[PDB]
Amino acid sequence: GNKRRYSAWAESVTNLPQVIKQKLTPLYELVKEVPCASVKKLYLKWALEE
Amino acid sequence: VTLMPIDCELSSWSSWTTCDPCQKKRYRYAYLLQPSQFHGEPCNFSDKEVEDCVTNRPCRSQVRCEGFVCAQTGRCVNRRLLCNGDNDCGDQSDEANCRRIYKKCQHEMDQYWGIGSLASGINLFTNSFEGPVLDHRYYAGGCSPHYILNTRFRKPYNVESYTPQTQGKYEFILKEYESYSDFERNVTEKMASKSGFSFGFELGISSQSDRGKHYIRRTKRFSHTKSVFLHARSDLEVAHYKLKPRSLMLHYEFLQRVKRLPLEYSYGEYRDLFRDFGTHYITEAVLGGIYEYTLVMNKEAMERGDYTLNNVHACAKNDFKISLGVSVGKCRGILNEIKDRNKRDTMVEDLVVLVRGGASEHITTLAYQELPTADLMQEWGDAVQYNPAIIKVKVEPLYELVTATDFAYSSTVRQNMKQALEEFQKEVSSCHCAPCQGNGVPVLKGSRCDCICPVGSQGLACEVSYRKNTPIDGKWNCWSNWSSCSGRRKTRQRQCNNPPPQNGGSPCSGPASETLDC
Amino acid sequence: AATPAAVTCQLSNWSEWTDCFPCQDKKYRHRSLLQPNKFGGTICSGDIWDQASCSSSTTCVRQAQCGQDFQCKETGRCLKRHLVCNGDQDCLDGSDEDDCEDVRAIDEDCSQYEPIPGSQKAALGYNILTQEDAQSVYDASYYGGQCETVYNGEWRELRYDSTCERLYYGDDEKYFRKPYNFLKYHFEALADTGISSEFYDNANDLLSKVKKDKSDSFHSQDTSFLNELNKYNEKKFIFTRIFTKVQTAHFKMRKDDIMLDEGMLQSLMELPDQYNYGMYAKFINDYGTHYITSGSMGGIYEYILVIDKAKMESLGITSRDITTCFHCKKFGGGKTERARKAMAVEDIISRVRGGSSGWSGGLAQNRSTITYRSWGRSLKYNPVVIDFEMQPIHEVLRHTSLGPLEAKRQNLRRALDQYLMEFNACRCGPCFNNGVPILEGTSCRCQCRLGSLGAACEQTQTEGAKADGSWSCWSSWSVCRAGIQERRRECDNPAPQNGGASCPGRKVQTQAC
Numbered sequence A: 001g002n003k004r005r006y007s008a009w010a011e012s013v014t015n016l017p018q019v020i021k022q023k024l025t026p027l028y029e030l031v032k033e034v035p036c037a038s039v040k041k042l043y044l045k046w047a048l049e050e
Numbered sequence B: 001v002t003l004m005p006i007d008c009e010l011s012s013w014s015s016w017t018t019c020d021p022c023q024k025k026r027y028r029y030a031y032l033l034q035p036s037q038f039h040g041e042p043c044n045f046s047d048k049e050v051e052d053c054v055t056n057r058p059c060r061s062q063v064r065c066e067g068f069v070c071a072q073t074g075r076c077v078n079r080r081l082l083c084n085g086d087n088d089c090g091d092q093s094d095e096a097n098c099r100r101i102y103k104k105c106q107h108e109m110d111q112y113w114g115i116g117s118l119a120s121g122i123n124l125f126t127n128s129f130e131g132p133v134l135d136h137r138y139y140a141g142g143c144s145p146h147y148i149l150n151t152r153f154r155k156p157y158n159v160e161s162y163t164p165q166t167q168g169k170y171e172f173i174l175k176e177y178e179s180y181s182d183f184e185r186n187v188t189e190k191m192a193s194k195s196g197f198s199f200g201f202e203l204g205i206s207s208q209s210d211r212g213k214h215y216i217r218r219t220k221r222f223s224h225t226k227s228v229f230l231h232a233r234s235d236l237e238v239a240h241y242k243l244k245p246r247s248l249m250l251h252y253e254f255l256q257r258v259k260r261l262p263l264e265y266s267y268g269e270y271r272d273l274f275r276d277f278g279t280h281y282i283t284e285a286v287l288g289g290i291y292e293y294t295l296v297m298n299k300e301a302m303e304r305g306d307y308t309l310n311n312v313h314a315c316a317k318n319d320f321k322i323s324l325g326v327s328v329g330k331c332r333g334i335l336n337e338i339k340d341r342n343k344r345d346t347m348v349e350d351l352v353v354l355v356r357g358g359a360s361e362h363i364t365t366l367a368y369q370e371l372p373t374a375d376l377m378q379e380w381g382d383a384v385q386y387n388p389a390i391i392k393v394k395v396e397p398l399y400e401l402v403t404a405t406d407f408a409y410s411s412t413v414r415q416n417m418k419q420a421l422e423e424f425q426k427e428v429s430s431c432h433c434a435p436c437q438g439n440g441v442p443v444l445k446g447s448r449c450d451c452i453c454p455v456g457s458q459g460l461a462c463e464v465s466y467r468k469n470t471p472i473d474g475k476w477n478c479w480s481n482w483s484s485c486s487g488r489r490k491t492r493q494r495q496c497n498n499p500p501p502q503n504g505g506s507p508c509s510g511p512a513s514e515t516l517d518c
Numbered sequence C: 001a002a003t004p005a006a007v008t009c010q011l012s013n014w015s016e017w018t019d020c021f022p023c024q025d026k027k028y029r030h031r032s033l034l035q036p037n038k039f040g041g042t043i044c045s046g047d048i049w050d051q052a053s054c055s056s057s058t059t060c061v062r063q064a065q066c067g068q069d070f071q072c073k074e075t076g077r078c079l080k081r082h083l084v085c086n087g088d089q090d091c092l093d094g095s096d097e098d099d100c101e102d103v104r105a106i107d108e109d110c111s112q113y114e115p116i117p118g119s120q121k122a123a124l125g126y127n128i129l130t131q132e133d134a135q136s137v138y139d140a141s142y143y144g145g146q147c148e149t150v151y152n153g154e155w156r157e158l159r160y161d162s163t164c165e166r167l168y169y170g171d172d173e174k175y176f177r178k179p180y181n182f183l184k185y186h187f188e189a190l191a192d193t194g195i196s197s198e199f200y201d202n203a204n205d206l207l208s209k210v211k212k213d214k215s216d217s218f219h220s221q222d223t224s225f226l227n228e229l230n231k232y233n234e235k236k237f238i239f240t241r242i243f244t245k246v247q248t249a250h251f252k253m254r255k256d257d258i259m260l261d262e263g264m265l266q267s268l269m270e271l272p273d274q275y276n277y278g279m280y281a282k283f284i285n286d287y288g289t290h291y292i293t294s295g296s297m298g299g300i301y302e303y304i305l306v307i308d309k310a311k312m313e314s315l316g317i318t319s320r321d322i323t324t325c326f327h328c329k330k331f332g333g334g335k336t337e338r339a340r341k342a343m344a345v346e347d348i349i350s351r352v353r354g355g356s357s358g359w360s361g362g363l364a365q366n367r368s369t370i371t372y373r374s375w376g377r378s379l380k381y382n383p384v385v386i387d388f389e390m391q392p393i394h395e396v397l398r399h400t401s402l403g404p405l406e407a408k409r410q411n412l413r414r415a416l417d418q419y420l421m422e423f424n425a426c427r428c429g430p431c432f433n434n435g436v437p438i439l440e441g442t443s444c445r446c447q448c449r450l451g452s453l454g455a456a457c458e459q460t461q462t463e464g465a466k467a468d469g470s471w472s473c474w475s476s477w478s479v480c481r482a483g484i485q486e487r488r489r490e491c492d493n494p495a496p497q498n499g500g501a502s503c504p505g506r507k508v509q510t511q512a513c
């Protein structure tokens, strides 16, 4: 590809970047602020296993 | 005659249903037994019939609205959504007579580009948008800052996210193949013979015989085959849309049409509902554009050339001299010559191009037969941001919108929709049609069936082509009825277009037979 | 075939005047078209339909067509009263917006968005016999107080602010107000192209030569025979088809509470509940046999090129020569003949339906990246109805706000059934050489493709070519002696001239008594 096109793309990425590297945390760690939150957090752990 | 127009057939009526206690009406309907095709007569647009009734019984009042009632629409809206500075009714009732309107969204805010398309239901069996089912202009407050580049948007209440997850996949495959083969011979025969006698004795006798023969044969054969395959495709993705899972605000029109559905099951009304709004709505979609180019070239040349020659000579002279003299010269010949030359040149080309999303300028220039300039592909992909197609869709059936929050007898309506939808999938299938010729695909189009004729085919049945023979792909006939319960089963004869004829193409899809629990 | 003869257009006598319609003060009567002028000949100056002023001697008792609904003075449009003083003139009278003291009666702040351009053609009726737009069926300008808008995905339009150097897209026309009758108007940019190209070229050559010579001499005798044949055959065939279909809209017309055009509304109320063929015929002739309820908005281009060349050349010669010598005598004789025939025929049709006279002409002349791009740009501004579905004009009645109308609807159905087999193009005579018969009003044409000339396309610059048959008109219905009736039609108008296609449909038709 052209030097111009690559350059311009690499510029535009600064404004529409995507996630390319991530470190994950399990989703059940967010089960919070709800009735039976502590129980739902375990059932979501088990459901992720399933 | 080759073609024979087949007129629409539709069943005798159902019974009249019992009078609907809410609608104070009764209903009757018919099934499309046979779509019209090949310029057949179309049936009257009266597969539904309706009657009024005496109110043999009352019914439940329309579901209580705890909120404010929008005068014209009757949209039940929350009292916090009055004097809001927004129209939440589709009507000014909410804002009508407000002593003070507290503008929340004071800034300049755009709607998400094409977001209102996604509020349209789709007919999944056609994959085609229908009437609006969801109101994506209802904001219910909101006014969180959402930006794309420098442009800030106001998200609909219904939409969970609309986010510019940009991506692009190009794919280019070019395959060129050549073969030539050449064959010649040259072959020659010549024969010459002489025999003569000359003697003295007085007496004298002489004889001479002359023989010449030539034979020549030549043969030439040539074959040249030249084949080009060129498939190019661009998949561009520009935004990810997801609908909220819960508490959707329906469009007025869909709301009302639902409100008018009969409580007793009668297929005709749910059929009309699907024909207005379709069967499913879009929960999650990937928005972007497609470009796809596919060229096929076959160049086949053959030459055959033959030469045959025969030559024959005979002369005989016999002379007897003793005065006395007698002589005879006797000579004869035949020549034979044959030349035979046969040449054929055949070129078959087809191209198909396909584009979705973007501006008409770019769409059409990409629809020309030449592969595009990178510049015009840039311009097209720029313009797809603003007018994208829907590449990926995840859909839920429309009955999942029918919710007690909105409708009396919600469960009953829901179940009716399930039943109706199941019948609708049968009645709208393309399987019903008579087969096209010419490898045509019958597309059922309401009460009549259209053959989409391929590239290089023409006419109502695709019967016109200059290609003598081309592979015909197999097409299923309609799946059988449900087998009576001892287990449940269906079968498909793969018959409606025979897969084998004319160098028959692909066999039909699997399964040929489908079985289930009752 | 020699030219057919002109016929004079011929009409039946006037039907009697209808009794003077109390609300209208009009008498009506119709003729029926007994013969169009066909292959030239005197057109009728008489019209098929006539109307005259007449005082009825009786009041318009029916004038109270509506009660609680607001009825406009000029016109029977009856509006749901929230529309009165709603800020939008919902009838041509404008009386619904007249004397409105309460300005806050306005329904909504919608008017900044103008109606969808090109939405009006979806309103117009359609005449399947002539493929011509009629008068409006739908009210293309009616919103019902609603403010449904449509996102115009092509809204981008470059603007350059000289004072700033900013190069930007003007926001104008980002949305359009959707008229009430449109259920949907899905902007959706699609294109599909299809090309095929097939070349078949074959050339064959033969030569065959015989010599047969005998000499026998002492008195001298000498006999020679020659037979030679040469025969050349060449056939060259090129066919290429280009179909590029561009789409920008899908629109669908509401099946419920269709707000008829005011003119249609009036014209409809004027129809008698009793059958009167002339009245309904006039109605159909005005509003068209058919009205439309599905649409795509597009540009289309189609290119077809067919070239056939064939050359055949033959030489034959024979000689036999004979000799008797010793005085000398010589003889000979035989047969020789020579012929060449060649022909080439080529034609192209290039047609564009789409958004600019200049560029659609250019692209009809010249296919290229330049004409495709500039025509595509032009399709931004003047897209065209590229496909549509339609229903018989009478089926709207079921779907109107008015109610049953079932007397009118059945009358209109009968009238249509007649009209489609009175003004039918089949009744114009045989157009030869794949000419298309057209019946406009009381008069016929044959539209001739360029190979043909003359009133019937009958004379052709070449002497004979494959041209297809077409149906005669249906005969009259039989008497139905049983509960069943018959009708008969023959593929003889014209017969297939040179073994073109026999016309495909039914030869025989049958009907419930």
Ligand SMILES: *[C@@H]1O[C@H](CO)[C@@H](O[C@@H]2O[C@H](CO)[C@@H](O)[C@H](O)[C@H]2NC(C)=O)[C@H](O)[C@H]1NC(C)=O
Pocket (backbone or CB within 6 Å): B184, B185, B186
């Ligand atoms: C058959 O004979 C012809 C005539 O000699 C051959 O073609 C010639 O080949 C020579 C040498 O390659 C060339 O110089 C001539 O110009 C050719 N003349 C023509 C008319 O082709 C041919 O190659 C021979 N074929 C075989 C199979 O022997």
